[PDB]
Amino acid sequence: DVIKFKEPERCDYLYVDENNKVHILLPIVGGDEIGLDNTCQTAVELITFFYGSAHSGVTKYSAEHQLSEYKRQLEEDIKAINSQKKISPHAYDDLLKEKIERLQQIEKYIELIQVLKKQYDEQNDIRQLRTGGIPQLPSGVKEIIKSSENAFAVRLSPYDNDKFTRFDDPLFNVKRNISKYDTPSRQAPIPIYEGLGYRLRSTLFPEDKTPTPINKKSLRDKVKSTVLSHYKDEDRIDGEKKDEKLNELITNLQNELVKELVKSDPQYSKLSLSKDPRGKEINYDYLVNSLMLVDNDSEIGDWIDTILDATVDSTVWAVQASSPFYQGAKEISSDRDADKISIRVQYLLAEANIYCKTNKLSDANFGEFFDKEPHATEIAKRVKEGFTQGADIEPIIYDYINSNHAELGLKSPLTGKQQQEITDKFTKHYNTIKESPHFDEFFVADPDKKGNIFSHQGRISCHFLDFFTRQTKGKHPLGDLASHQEALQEGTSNRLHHKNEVVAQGYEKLDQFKKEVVKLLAENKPKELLDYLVATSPTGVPNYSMLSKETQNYIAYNRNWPAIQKELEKATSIPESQKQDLSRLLSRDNLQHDNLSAITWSKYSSKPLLDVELNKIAEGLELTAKIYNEKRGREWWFAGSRNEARKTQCEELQRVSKEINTLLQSESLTKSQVLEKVLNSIETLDKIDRDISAESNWFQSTLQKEVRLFRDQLKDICQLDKYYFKSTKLDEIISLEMEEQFQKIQDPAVQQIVRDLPSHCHNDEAIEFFKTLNPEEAAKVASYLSLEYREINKSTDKKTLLEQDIPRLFKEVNTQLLSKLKEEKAIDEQVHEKLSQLADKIAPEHFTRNNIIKWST
């Protein structure tokens, strides 16, 4: 007796634009703007899109299945709307239209995915994703990346490089060592002694083992150097005029602090060093005799230290943005450190190169220039210089670019604004990849520029149609989807919203409709209501097409109904077929009167599904283990030899993946089951990380950085509010914390009542009130609430006071009938006064003409 609308406001891979065009987006890599380099990255996204899982899963999470499910939900919603058409022909016409348009497009995309996989995969370009040991980007995808305007790969030169690069057309490329994977031992690479990478590494820490000092002093270290530049080693705050030298130093320090602050952030202009954060006045007595910190003849700097510590807040220090280059360390005192910075520098050059490419200033490969001499060595030197002096590293690089701006394919060098744009991107993106296992390559996207690459749901993606067109080589025409790619290009941005507002508005429009209906009834405006109900949409559909059990009752049982009924008869501007519709739907005295179904939609469809997200994690663990074992050679045979610790850890990853997988297989999944598996999985991953940490000895293990990533992902899942859950039992997307709150209602009859109630009755305060009731008290309240919109909070809501409020309203509503009957003379005064006493005790739904006739007899 309730219609539950099942089309979700969100679906993996599915974007719906403002003109209701369905766009499916094939993902290339996971991330926004930049995607991290991990053994499996590009793999996981594609594998999932095309097949639910590489193996050990159902086809449940593929694009085809997910779209087929979406398709089914629409068909259910359409069938439901149609069920209401028998009662009110216009019912939900706008929604029905929108839902049919999406249905038809969804169906077409599904055929294409079916077709592409069967007819146009003869070389096994898709298939290899799930079978081949190290999956490759498909051909279509590589073509899309090559031809892109807003997305590019950059290849870097870390010391321990990995030859299995996925991106074959980097914009930025530098010379790399011979990967350990091209050596027989497979344990360390063969270094090369030319190139930018070697020049940076060897310069920042040479084979003489002579460290490079990192002397960065700011901002307090800087201010203390500038203020002490004017003072001597000897002078104290002593002599006859001790308060005056103090006050001068406080003013001088104050001035220099606000001066270096505004340069960094002009917004801390009115700060005082003459009073502490409490509000008490800073003076000689206060620092020497009340706190005891600074004695008499204390040094100038210790006075400065203490003034600062007493007056300044802890937040302000370190307030200014920090370069990725300055991580805090004293000096570059090992090889590990040198590579961290080699890569940092390389990545900055990569980022500048990217800026210059997306902005059409150059088409060149900056790395092809900086690997050549003298440039390789000269930039490595200037950087080492810079670190010792503590200077800003970023401009050193920009200056050298400007110094050779023509050689790098630019007409003008980089402006000060352009330079800051680059620096800030470099900062954002480096911090994202700071803890990447690998630094071989990175795919970077710009969604604020036009091109063939997009950003949707935390995936960097291409249009599925672009990939399809290309994979089939133009053979299968798109039919009605042939204009769709264009349509998306024609958009405002390439950064697409994670949820689909067009769908969400479909429902919000219904909510808005009841809200108005509720308002106009409370303001007792029957003529405006009737006008609002016949008012049309741009498609000409009258507003009464959004009537449902809730609103139909609100009107039918209202005091303004007789006024509304009169307005209805006495009106000419409204066609008779709607004039009947309305009287049929809202006059309970009409013999053709029939009740519409109640209407609901999920309040949590816009959130990512728990199971979908877990699947991605399981899938990622499997892949990692698989491509890891496929990257070792020629040592496949048992056994270690220390083989087990590396190998039993990989067995441990699969164990987790299998377990998460079997967790998902279960229907009737509960908050506590999920939480329990997820922590037990987190702990296993934690032990693995711990086992590695001890072993050393000491080398940074890529696997450690990989398990950390997976643990974090699983930690994110424990915030179950951020996800929704498909209940297979009730076929609806719910929240596990709403089911918690519903379950916390003891008695099953009361609980069900509360569930069947409108959304306004599903808040926390309300369910507490309702659990102080019994099944008979509950149904009385339910009926009560169906008569006129009221909110139940704790305050002000009294169970007793409510049992006076119900009777009042029952009696008021039912009198409408009795007064009508005695005016008609359809009842004796015998039964009029007998019923008039009964009026406050009988639910209006049961207080009807037939019932009275039956009742008297």
Numbering used by the authors: 8 to 864
Article sentences:
The effector SidC and its paralog SdcA anchor on the Legionella-containing vacuole (LCV) and are important for the recruitment of ER proteins to the LCV. Recent data demonstrated that SidC and SdcA are ubiquitin E3 ligases and that their activity is required for the enrichment of ER proteins and ubiquitin conjugates on the LCV. Recent structural studies of SidC revealed a novel N-terminal SNL domain that represents a unique family of ubiquitin E3 ligases.
Crystals were also obtained with a truncated form of SidC (aa 1–871, from here on referred to as SidC871) in which 46 residues were deleted from the C-terminus. Unlike any other known PI(4)P-binding domain, the P4C domain of SidC comprise a four α-helix bundle and the PI(4)P binding site resides in a highly positively charged pocket formed at one end of the bundle. A pocket is created at the other end by two loops (L1 and L2) connecting α1, α2 and α3, α4, respectively.The calculated electrostatic surface potentials revealed that this pocket is highly positively charged and it is the only area clustered with positive charges in the domain. The interaction between the P4C and SNL domains is mainly mediated by extensive hydrophobic interactions between residues L629 and I633 of the P4C domain and a hydrophobic patch consisting of residues V50, I53, A60, I140, and P141 near the ligase catalytic site on the SNL domain.
